[PDB]
Paper text:
In this study, we presented a ligand-observed MS approach for high-throughput screen of a 384-member fragment library as well as reliable estimation of binding affinity of each fragment hit. This approach was integrated into a FBLD program targeting the RNA polymerase of [name] (HCV), NS5B, which is a particularly attractive target for anti-HCV drug development. Similar to other nucleotide polymerases, the domain distribution of apo HCV NS5B polymerase bears an anatomical resemblance to a right hand with subdomains representing the fingers, thumb and palm. Structural and mechanistic studies of NS5B have indicated the existence of multiple allosteric binding domains including palm I, II and III pockets and thumb I and II sites targeted by reported inhibitors. The proposed discovery pipeline combining our MS-based approach and other biophysical techniques resulted in identification and validation of ten new fragments bound to two distinctive domains of NS5B, among which five were successfully translated to X-ray structures of fragment-bound complexes valuable for structure-based design of potent inhibitors.
To characterize the binding modes of the fragments studied, they were soaked in NS5B crystals to obtain the protein complex X-ray structures. Inspection of the crystal structures indicated that fragments 114, 204, 117, and 328 all bound at the palm I allosteric domain, while fragment 162 bound at the thumb region. Fragments 114 and 204 showed higher binding affinity than the others in the previous MS-based validation assay. The X-ray structure of NS5B in complex with 114 revealed that its cyano group engages deep in a small hydrophobic pocket, where it forms hydrophobic interactions with Met414 and Tyr415. Moreover, the interaction could be enhanced by a π-π conjugate between its benzene ring and Tyr448. The measured binding degrees of fragments 114 and 130 were close to the theoretical value. In this study, four fragment hits and the designed ligands all bound in the palm I pocket, where an overwhelming majority of NS5B inhibitors were also found to bind Specifically, Met414, Cys366 and Tyr448 in the palm domain of NS5B have been documented to be the “hot spots” for binding of high-potency inhibitors3854 and they were also found to be the dominant sites for fragment binding in our study.
Author numbering: 1 to 22, 28 to 148, 154 to 539, 548 to 562
Write the structure that this text describes.
């Protein structure tokens, strides 16, 4: 079938959308843009086509193996009150007379509607359920993406998703997929696994595989396969009917209504904005890629999967033979309707592989031992940091980034420095901020960072020191490219910030001591002082 059919009604904005900044961070303000509904038509072209899927024996053996593991999972229905509490405070309000706040407070009005939306699921496994369709506002840097398309149901139904399926998507993927399930790894757990599976090969070769617009490629068959997988769990029979209902009425497809209540058409592929999207896309990607490995007679594959993002580390068979096996791999994905975006490439250096927007690189600790840590090109982080300082958004990527990328050259010299500067100047150190980790919202007190980082990356994150030539040049380049003060200017800014931090005592002093010891010249000596990197919930409307 067609991934989407369109009526012609436009995808419409909710309010005024900014596509530009209105400066101590970066001078090239004209290089940073946000996507808007003005690019919707273009994204619409990219994401719509007919899907021709052809399964094979490898697909069925992997599935049968996945089903066997899934059958050992037992999972419980969630109550209204547990599901309510998981709803973020600023989730989109219902069109039936209530908002997230009412939900979170167990207002009998929201809860009654939730009850009646559940009953209807139990009674009706057929009528497609309505979705809103919207163009996302995401900041990027020049060199231009069309907005991505977010699709999601009413709050009422979201709460019910949590009821039927929160336990399933939190628990199953790890069990079905073992060490291949990416969202079980904190950043240092993730480097840990990758580096060890790399060294475990005799003659290693790795590749990432970018699937072209994954959500579009996910077929209605795919989503029932996914369901059948969920169905193998030992489920309470009321969860069983809700799950059949939700997949048939929402996950499989349905009508697309825009911000003004007009009909834009009909989706027959993955909604980005539903509970099962991450889990589903991971299962579906792991399944299809596991089979593509078997087709291409790739030897001794270890895989790592995070939604549509896929890495494979395996035994090389020579460079010709590799390049070819990759072409066979690609051909099979394509048959399974997960065609290529960038055509995949063999790498023989773990550092050059990019997966989950990230790569392994190596630094040294105080003692001089070698430490592997996880980094990325800092462009999008810096851009969005410049955006976030300019226009006050309720979302704070800088902080997530500091948390995910705390050992890096750039998060430490640039992000830590800049933002502790804003917070000191604004007297807002003590204020918690919401940030997103694997699609769940957490409230985080910026003063806790020292502990947080020690816990997630160890003590060495405060003293890594001979970063690699490739890393340094990427960061230095990105800086010139974007118009950001070079690294030596951040050193002098950090000495200033550290000092102000220290004079305040308490936890601000701890932040200054630990976060900024790289900047001093004579080092102080640094002694010691969750449910976070467990699952993927992006699109999933989850709060903690
Ligand atoms: N750190 C980390 C992993 C990660 C980063 C960004 C993203 O969209 C998904 C996963």
């Amino acid at each position: 079938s067609m991934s989407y059919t369109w009526t012609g009604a436009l995808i419409t904005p909710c309010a005024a959308e900014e596509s530009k900044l209105p400066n101590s961070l970066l001078r090239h303000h004209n290089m940073v843009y946000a996507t808007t509904s003005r690019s919707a038509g273009l994204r619409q072209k990219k994401v719509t086509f007919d899907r021709l899927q052809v399964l094979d024996d490898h697909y069925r053996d992997v599935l049968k193996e996945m089903k066997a593991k899934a059958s050992t999972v037992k999972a419980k229905l969630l109550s209204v009150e547990e599901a309510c509490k998981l709803t973020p405070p600023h989730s989109a309000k219902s069109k039936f007379g209530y908002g997230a706040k009412d939900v979170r407070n167990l207002s009998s009005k929201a809860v009654n509607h939730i009850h009646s939306v559940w009953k209807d699921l139990l009674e009706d496994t057929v009528t497609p359920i309505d979705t809103t369709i919207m163009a996302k506002n995401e900041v990027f840097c020049v060199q231009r993406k069309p907005a991505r398309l977010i699709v999601f149901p009413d709050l009422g139904v979201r709460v019910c998703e949590k009821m039927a399926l929160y336990d399933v998507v939190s628990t199953l993927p790890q069990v079905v997929m073992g060490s291949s399930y990416g969202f079980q790894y904190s950043p240092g757990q993730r480097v840990e696994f990758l580096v060890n599976t790399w060294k475990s090969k005799k003659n290693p070769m790795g590749f990432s595989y970018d699937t072209r617009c994954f959500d579009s490629t996910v077929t209605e068959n795919d989503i029932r396969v996914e369901e059948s997988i969920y169905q193998c769990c030992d489920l309470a029979p009321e969860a069983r009917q809700a799950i059949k209902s939700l997949t048939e009425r929402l996950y499989i497809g349905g009508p697309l209504t825009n911000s003004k209540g007009q009909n834009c058409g009909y989706r027959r592929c993955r909604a980005s904005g539903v509970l099962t999207t991450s889990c589903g896309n991971t299962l579906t990607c792991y399944l299809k890629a596991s089979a593509a490995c078997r087709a291409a007679k790739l030897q001794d594959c270890t895989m790592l999967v995070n939604g549509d993002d896929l890495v494979v580390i395996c035994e090389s068979a020579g460079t010709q033979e590799d390049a070819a096996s990759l072409r066979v791999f690609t051909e099979a994905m394509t048959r399974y309707s997960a065609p290529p975006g960038d055509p995949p490439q063999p790498e023989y250096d773990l550092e050059l592989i990019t997966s989950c927007s990230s790569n392994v690189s190596v630094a040294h600790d105080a003692s001089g031992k070698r430490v592997y840590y996880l980094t990325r090109d800092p462009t999008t982080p810096l851009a969005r940091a410049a955006w976030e300082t300019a226009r006050h958004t309720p979302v704070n990527s800088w902080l997530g980034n500091i948390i995910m990328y705390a050992p890096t050259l750039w998060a430490r010299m640039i992000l830590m420095t800049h933002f502790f500067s804003i917070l000191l100047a604004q007297e807002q150190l003590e204020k918690a901020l919401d940030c997103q980790i694997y699609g769940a919202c957490y409230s985080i007190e910026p003063l806790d960072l020292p502990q947080i980082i020690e816990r997630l990356h160890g003590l060495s994150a405060f003293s890594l020191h001979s970063y690699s030539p490739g890393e340094i040049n990427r960061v230095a380049s990105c800086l010139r490219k974007l118009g950001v003060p070079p690294l030596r200017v951040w050193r002098h800014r950090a000495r200033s910030v550290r000092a102000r931090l220290l004079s305040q005592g308490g936890r601000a002093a701890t932040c200054g001591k630990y976060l900024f010891n790289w900047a001093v010249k004579t080092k102080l000596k640094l002694t010691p002082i969750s449910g976070w990197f467990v699952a993927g919930y992006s699109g999933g409307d989850i709060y903690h």
